[PDB]
Amino acid sequence: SGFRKMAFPSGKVEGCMVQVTCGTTTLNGLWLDDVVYCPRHVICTSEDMLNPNYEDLLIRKSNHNFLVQAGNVQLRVIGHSMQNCVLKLKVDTANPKTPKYKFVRIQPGQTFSVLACYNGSPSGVYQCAMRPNFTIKGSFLNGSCGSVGFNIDYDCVSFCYMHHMELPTGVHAGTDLEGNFYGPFVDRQTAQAAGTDTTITVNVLAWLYAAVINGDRWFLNRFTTTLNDFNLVAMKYNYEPLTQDHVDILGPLSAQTGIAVLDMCASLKELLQNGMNGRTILGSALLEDEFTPFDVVRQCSGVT
Amino acid sequence: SGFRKMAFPSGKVEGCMVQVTCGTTTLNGLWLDDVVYCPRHVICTSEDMLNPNYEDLLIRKSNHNFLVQAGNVQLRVIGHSMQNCVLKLKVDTANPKTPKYKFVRIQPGQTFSVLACYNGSPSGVYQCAMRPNFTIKGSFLNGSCGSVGFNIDYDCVSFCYMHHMELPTGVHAGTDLEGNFYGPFVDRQTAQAAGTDTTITVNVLAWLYAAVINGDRWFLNRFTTTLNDFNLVAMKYNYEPLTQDHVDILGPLSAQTGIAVLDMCASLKELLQNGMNGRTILGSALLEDEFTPFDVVRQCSGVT
Ligand SMILES: N#CCOc1ccccc1C(=O)NCc1cnsc1
Ligand SMILES: N#CCOc1ccccc1C(=O)NCc1cnsc1
C-alpha cells in the first residue's frame, strides 16, 4: 500500500553520463557504445545563442575541440557529426557500462524518469511527463543540458528525452535521442511561448484507480456518464478528450477494482464540477495527471 | 528553474541489493562489505507473525538456512547474528560494488530516498521523510521488506532506514541499520496505531523559499510575526513548533531571497488561516513538508 511519484532506478543511466566541454561551454553527454550524445548548443558561446547557424559554427570545430570526460578520465574523440539538434561524438572506447538500450520518441501523456546531471555527474532523479504542449515540468539549472529522460523494461533502457533549454516561463524543452525537439521548440534564445497545458485525462483516471486500490474511495459516486458527455465536461476544464483507446488502456485497472471506466469518469466529472472541498486523494489536494495506466499497474503490482 | 520531489541517484544502493530467503519467506537484503543486512522477520512463517520469540525461532536456523542471492549468483553464509530487529549474515565475499557508507539514525523531519525492491531487484526510487510520529508514507508491497532509505554526500551513502512493515492504516514502519525501529513499532502483527501526523513546519518554510526562488510569490504578504505568535497558529493547525534552531537552519534561504524567516512565517500563518483559495504553489494545492532546508539548497544550487 501507498502511492508515490516513483522514478526508475537510475544506476543504468548513471553509468552513461559524461561531461562534454567545447570551448568555454560545459554540459552533459550520454555515452552508449562508442558514441557520446549531447545537445548541439555545446558549440555555442553566449553571443551565438540569439541566432546561431549550427552548420557554420560546426565548421570551426574539430574532434580535439570537444573534451569528453567519463568520470575523471578523458575520452578520445575520433569523429563528430550533427544529427538534427544533437552531436554524436564518436569516441575510441565503447562505454563498458552500456546497458541494453533503445531510442524512442514518446507521445504527450507518457511519463519518464529524468536523471538530472551537472558536469557529467548525476545529482538527482525524478519522474516527469511529456506535457500535451510538448514541454516538461522539470527541475533543471544551467549546465543541466544533456541530462536524459528514460523508461526501463527489466534490463532495457528506452531513452526518450534529452534536455536542451528552459523557456522564459520556466518550463523545459528538449529533444528525443535523434535530436528532434518535442514540439515546435528551437535551440535558440528567442520568443517561444508554450501552448495550453491541458490535463492528461487518461492519467487522472489511472491515478483515481490507484487511489481506490489504496483505500481512498470518498470520491466514488452513484453516477455514470457517456464518453461524449464526459468530454463536454473535460473540454470546459482544459482536460484532454478521452478516447475509446484510453478506455481500453484503463481496462485492467477497471477489471482489478470492479469500477467501470465510465463510472470513474462520472466521479472525475463531479470532482471537476465541485472541487475537492478541502479533502485529499493520495495525499494530494489536486488531480494528479503524471502517472500513466501502465505506471499504476507497475507500482501497484511491483514490476522489477 | 523548476522544483521537483527529487530522489538521490540510486546506482550506489542498487549495487548492494540482494535477495534473502529463509524457508518459504523471501525479502530484500543490503550487502555492504562481507555482511548482508535484512529484517529479522525473514525467519518467521505466517503462523509466527502474531507473537514471535525471535531468539527461540533463531535457534532452529543455521548458516545454510539463509539463501542469499546477489543477482543470479548464490552467496555463501559463513555466519549469522541478530542485532535488535535485523539479521547480519556474514558472507564469504565482500560486495565488490560496496560504496563508501555510514549508518545513521535520522530525526523526524529529515528526508531520504527509498530504493523499493522485490526479490533483491530494484523496482523504483522515491523521496520520503521520517514523519513526526516515526512512520513513513512509503509505497511498499509484500516482499518490499529489506528495501532501504538513504542520503548521499558526494560519494558516501548514509543508510538511515530499512523497511519492515505496514501498519493497519497503510503507513510504514522500519528500523535504522542497527535494527532499532523508528518510534514505538514492533515487528509483529499486532495493534499498532500511529500517533498524530503533524506537519513539518521548518520544511514547509523551506518549500515556501523554494517557491519564491522559482517565481511563485503570490502568497508573500505585508505582515510579520514573532516565534511565539506563529507557534500559537502552528499548534492549532497541527504543525510542529518552530524553534530558534529552525530559524538558523533557514538562514541561507532567508539570505538568498532577502525575506526574513519571521516574514515567511507570517505568510505561512495567513496561508493556514485562509487556505489557498483554489491557487497553487510549485504546482501543488497543499503545503509541502517533505523537503528540508538542505534539500532546497541542494536542488536549487545543483549539488552533485
Ligand atoms: N532560459 C534559459 C536557458 O538556461 C537554462 C536554464 C535551465 C535549463 C537549461 C538552460 C541552459 O543551459 N540552456 C542553454 C541554451 C539552450 N539553448 S540556447 C542556450
Ligand atoms: N500489514 C502488513 C504487512 O504486509 C506488508 C505490506 C507492506 C509492506 C511490508 C509488508 C510485509 O511484508 N510485512 C511482513 C511482516 C512484518 N512484520 S510481521 C510480518
3-state secondary structure chain B: CCCCCCECCCHHHHCCEEEEEECCEEEEEEEECCEEEEEHHHHCCCCCCCCCCHHHHHHCCCHHHEEEEECCEEECEEEEEEECCEEEEEECCCCCCCCEEEECCCCCCCEEEEEEEECCEEEEEEEEECCCCCCECCCCCCCCCCCEEEEEECCEEEEEEEEEEECCCCCEEEECCCCCECCCCCCCCCCCCCCCCCECHHHHHHHHHHHHHCCCCCCCCCCCCCHHHHHHHHHHCCECCCCHHHHHHCHHHHHHHCCCHHHHHHHHHHHHHHCCCCCCECCECCCCCCCCHHHHHHHHHCCC
Q: Are B123 and A152 in contact (CB under 8 A)?
A: no
Q: Tell me how far the alpha carbon of residue A164 lies from the centroid of ligand 1, in angstroms.
A: 7
CA distance A90 to B124: 32
Q: For a pocket test of ligand 1, which of A48, A166, A167 has the largest count of ligand atoms closer than 8 A to its C-beta?
A: A166
Burial label for B49, CB within 10 Å (0-12, 13-18, 19+), is: middle
Other Cβ atoms closer than 10 A to A301: 12
Distance from CA of A286 to the nearest CA of B (A): 6
Phi–psi pair at A224, nearest 5 degrees: -140, 170
Residue A134: closest CA among A184, A88, A93: A184
Q: Chain B partners of A115 at a C-beta cutoff of 8 Å? A: 9
Q: Chain A partners of B304 at a C-beta cutoff of 8 Å? A: 117-119, 121-123
Q: Which CATH superfamily is domain A198-301 in?
A: main proteinase (3clpro) structure, domain 3 (1.10.1840.10)
Q: What nine digits make up the cell of A38?
A: 549531447
- Three-point CA angle B121, A113, A40, nearest 5°: 130
CA distance A47 to A65: 18
Q: Are B8 and A125 in contact (CB under 8 A)?
A: yes
Q: What nine digits make up the cell of B3?
A: 522544483
| Cross-chain residue pair A9–B115, CB shorter than 8 Å | yes
CA distance A106 to A69: 29
Q: Chain A partners of B285 at a C-beta cutoff of 8 Å? A: 276, 284-286
User: Is the CB of B166 inside a 6 Å radius of any atom of ligand 2?
Assistant: yes
Instruction: Answer left, alpha or beta for residue A143, where phi above 0 means left and psi between -120 and 50 means alpha.
Output: left
3-class DSSP assignment, residue A3: coil
Residues paired with B123 in a beta bridge: none
CA distance B186 to B284: 35
Q: Tell me how far the alpha carbon of residue B286 lies from the centroid of ligand 2, in angstroms.
A: 30
User: Is the CB of B272 inside a 6 Å radius of any atom of ligand 2?
Assistant: no
User: Is the CB of A185 inside a 6 Å radius of any atom of ligand 1?
Assistant: no
Residues paired with B159 in a beta bridge: B103, B150
A106-124 b/e with 16+ CB inside 10 Å = b? bebbbbbbbbbbbbbbbbb
Q: Are B38 and B144 in contact (CB under 8 A)?
A: no
Phi–psi pair at B111, nearest 5 degrees: -110, 155
Amino acid at B162: M
Question: Quick one: resolution in A?
Answer: 1.8
Sequence-distant (6+) residues with CB within 8 A of A81 are A87, A88, A90
Residue B150: closest CA among B194, B100, B196, B188: B100
Residues paired with B112 in a beta bridge: B128
Q: Which of B41, B163, B164, B246 is the catalytic position?
A: B41
Q: Quote the distance between the C-alpha of residue B20 and its chain's center.
A: 22
CA distance B208 to B219: 9
Helix and strand numbers (H, E) in chain A are 8, 13
Domain ranges (residues) in chain B = 1-14+100-197, 15-99, 198-301
B22 among known catalytic residues? no
- Cα dist. B279→A73, A238, A274, B125 in Å? 49, 16, 15, 29
Establish whether domains B1-14+100-197 and B15-99 are of one fold: yes
CA distance B99 to B115: 15
Amino acid at B292: T
- Cα dist. A204→A199, A201, A241, B300 in Å? 8, 5, 12, 29
Q: Chain A partners of B3 at a C-beta cutoff of 8 Å? A: 139
Please, what sign has the CA dihedral across residues A271, A272, A276, A280?
Answer: positive
Q: Which residues of A are catalytic?
A: 41, 145
CA distance A104 to A93: 24
Distance from CA of A246 to the nearest CA of B (A): 25
Fold of A1-14+100-197: Thrombin, subunit H (2.40.10)
Q: Are A129 and A149 in contact (CB under 8 A)?
A: no
Q: What nine digits make up the cell of A244?
A: 475509446
Instruction: Sort strands A66-70 and A73-75 into parallel, antiparallel or unpaired.
Output: antiparallel
CA distance B282 to B42: 42
CA distance A254 to B299: 38
Q: Which of B145, B160, B163, B246 is the catalytic position?
A: B145
Give CATH for domain B15-99.
2.40.10.10
Distance from CA of B169 to the nearest CA of A (A): 9
How many residues are listed for chain B in this entry? 304
Q: Are A129 and A111 in contact (CB under 8 A)?
A: yes
